[PDB]
């Protein structure tokens, strides 16, 4: 669920910053807590098994972070088959949010022999 | 494609049963058919009624009203002139009157019994004081109370008031009971 997603994300974000030297208020307060800008890279390890409604809500939730001037977010999608499953399952509003800045790369072990 | 279908139902009720029983039981104790046949032959012999413009106009509205409650096929519109001409013949009037058309429409409606028929499922109410009756009576009483004094007279004839409002007796009787 979105609640568990945000809680675990903030937990890991705090744990990582603890070695420098649970909610969006942590993201707001990060620059005053550690004096540095925050860049987040999100690794969706297996997209097909993820509840796409929960993922869509989580993406909309993360969209609120752009109000902060010191936060940058990157998204990594491990796709097994194709963009077709994402286009079928996600809402067409969230697809437009993703598509404004995306890259497509075929990392399969088989490529033209 | 029939012209008239009559739903002649029997309801168990002591009062109507008494009326029918007292009509029947006293008949077998102890106009004539000749004149009836004479009248029937005469009317068919002489009168050939023609539909008037005003009588024609009401057919459109009656058929549209039967239509919008949709089994109101075009077949019943044949009856809406067949019965009118027969009514004009029975009156012996040489033309079909608007009253004749309205009576024929009423006869068709009563035969089919649409007013007691459920428009949703086609079922029939068994019974055929209500809040809509209360509201209509209250509004009518208020309107007649306003009108009876809005005119430059303290009182007026009830026929003129009825024609002015309907275009009633119970409401005015109740007002009289209240000395209004």
């Amino acid at each position: 669920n979105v609640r568990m997603m945000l809680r675990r994300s903030m937990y890991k974000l705090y744990s990582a910053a603890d070695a420098e030297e649970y909610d969006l208020s942590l993201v707001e307060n990060f620059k005053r807590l550690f004096g540095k800008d925050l860049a987040m890279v999100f690794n969706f390890k297996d997209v097909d098994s993820i509840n796409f409604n929960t993922l869509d809500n989580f993406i909309i939730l993360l969209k609120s972070a752009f109000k902060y001037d010191h936060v940058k977010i990157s998204l990594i999608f491990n796709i097994n088959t194709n963009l077709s499953n994402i286009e079928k399952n996600l809402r067409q509003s969230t697809i437009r949010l993703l598509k404004r800045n995306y890259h497509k790369l075929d990392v399969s072990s088989n490529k033209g022999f | 494609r029939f012209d008239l279908v009559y739903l002649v139902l029997d309801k168990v009720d002591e009062k109507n049963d008494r009326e029918l029983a007292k009509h029947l039981t006293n008949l077998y104790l102890e106009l004539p058919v000749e004149f009836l046949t004479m009248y029937i032959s005469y009317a068919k012999e002489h009168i050939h009624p023609i539909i008037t413009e005003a009588a024609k106009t009401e057919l459109v509205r009656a058929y549209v009203g039967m239509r919008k409650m949709g089994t109101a096929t075009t077949r019943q519109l044949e009856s809406m002139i067949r019965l009118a001409e027969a009514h004009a013949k029975m009156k012996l009037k040489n033309v079909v009157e608007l009253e004749d058309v309205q009576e024929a429409v009423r006869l068709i409606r009563s035969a089919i019994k649409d007013y007691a028929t459920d428009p949703k499922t086609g079922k029939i109410d068994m019974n055929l004081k209500s809040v809509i009756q209360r509201k209509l009576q209250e509004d009518l009483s208020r309107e007649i109370m306003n009108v009876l004094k809005d005119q430059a007279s303290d009182s007026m004839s009830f026929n003129e008031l009825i024609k002015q409002i309907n275009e009633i007796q119970e409401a005015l009787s109740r007002l009289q009971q209240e000395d209004k």
């Binding site: 979105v2 609640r3 969006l24 963009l83 509003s93 437009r96 993703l98 | -």
Partner: protein, 346 residues
């Protein structure tokens, strides 16, 4: 003091209604107020514009979108009210209460009363508005939850200077109808009409697109000496009108969906602008026909499978849509639209 009315177009009834329920006298403003409108109806924008038009007002902004559940919702209210009261009246010596100790609504009432007691020495009564945007957008929500926010003002000491005048915004209508008998003063927002959406997007994105790097690169490449910002705006407006007329049936009268098509097709549309297309939008449309014939909202041999995999899928589709009755009839030598049924491995 008298409130000044903003000039928000396509909302010139609600901006006047807000002047009815919001005023400098805390004895006039009601204890509750709800603004109702679906997504993209302009509620947040209109309310923020109204508050920015009258700086003398005092407000707190929170988003249940960020505040996942009700406990953060109360904690943020307490913390932000404490900070705002310190900001507004630094001169008054005051102490602190922990905003992280709020576990139940009664504890919120207790903390609020304790804080307001400190400011009892205020000269005049103060009108404070707490703004929660999208109350029904809360992720963990229930019907009994909203009742706890309506009848909260009267648990305060009514003689206190600080009066909380809550403001809520709601999206749905199945939510608000549950509370009709409370007769809360409610202001409504309808969906924008097609003409309204067309005018609003032109008013909004024209300046955003008149200054993008791609067009001023392509102007240099094409050596457009006579290009002016007035013609720049006209080109952008032509682009927006073309997208609207081509995709209104696809998106509806929705501002958000059209904005993203305007963003996506904008580079490709720019790529077709040349010396010949400066003054003839018809020719540019002709050159850009293939861009309009396709939505291009798609994220893009469709499934690379072994022969065994392909035949397994073919058999599985038969299993999930053919009755078990016909297996022996068809395969032994002796529906397009319904949901698929289950089948066994054998």
């Amino acid at each position: 003091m008298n409130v000044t009315t903003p000039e928000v177009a396509f909302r010139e009834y609600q901006t006047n209604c807000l002047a009815s329920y919001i005023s400098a006298d805390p004895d006039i403003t009601p204890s509750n107020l709800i603004l109702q409108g679906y997504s993209g109806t302009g509620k947040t924008y209109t309310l923020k514009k109204y508050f920015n038009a009258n700086p003398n007002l005092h407000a707190v902004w929170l988003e249940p979108v960020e505040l996942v559940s009700w406990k953060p919702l109360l904690q943020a209210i307490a913390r932000t009210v404490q900070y705002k009261l310190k900001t507004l009246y630094p001169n008054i010596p005051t102490t602190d209460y922990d905003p992280l100790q709020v576990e139940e609504p009664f504890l919120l009432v207790k903390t609020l009363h304790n804080i307001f007691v400190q400011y009892e020495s205020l000269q005049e009564k103060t009108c404070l508005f707490l703004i929660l945007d999208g109350f029904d957008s809360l992720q963990d929500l229930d019907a009994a939850l909203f009742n706890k926010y309506i009848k909260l003002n009267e648990l305060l000491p009514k003689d206190s200077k600080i009066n909380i005048k809550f403001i809520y915004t709601m999206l749905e209508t199945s939510f608000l109808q549950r509370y009709s008998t409370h007769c809360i003063p409610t202001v409504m927002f309808p969906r924008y009409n097609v003409d309204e959406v067309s005018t609003i997007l032109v008013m909004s994105r024209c300046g955003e697109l008149m200054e993008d790097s791609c067009l001023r690169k392509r102007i240099i490449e094409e050596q457009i000496t006579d290009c002016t910002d007035d013609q720049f705006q006209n080109v952008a407006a032509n682009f927006i009108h073309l997208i609207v007329q081509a995709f209104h049936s696809y998106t509806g009268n929705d501002i958000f969906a059209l904005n993203d098509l305007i963003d996506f097709k904008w580079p490709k549309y720019v790529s077709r602008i040349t010396k010949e297309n400066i003054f003839e939008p018809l020719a540019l449309y002709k050159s850009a026909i293939k861009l309009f014939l396709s939505t291009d909202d798609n994220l893009s041999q469709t499934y690379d499978l072994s022969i065994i995999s392909k035949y397994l899928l073919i058999a599985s589709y038969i299993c999930s849509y053919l009755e078990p009755r016909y297996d022996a009839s068809i395969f032994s030598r002796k529906p397009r639209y319904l949901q698929p049924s289950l089948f066994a491995i054998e």
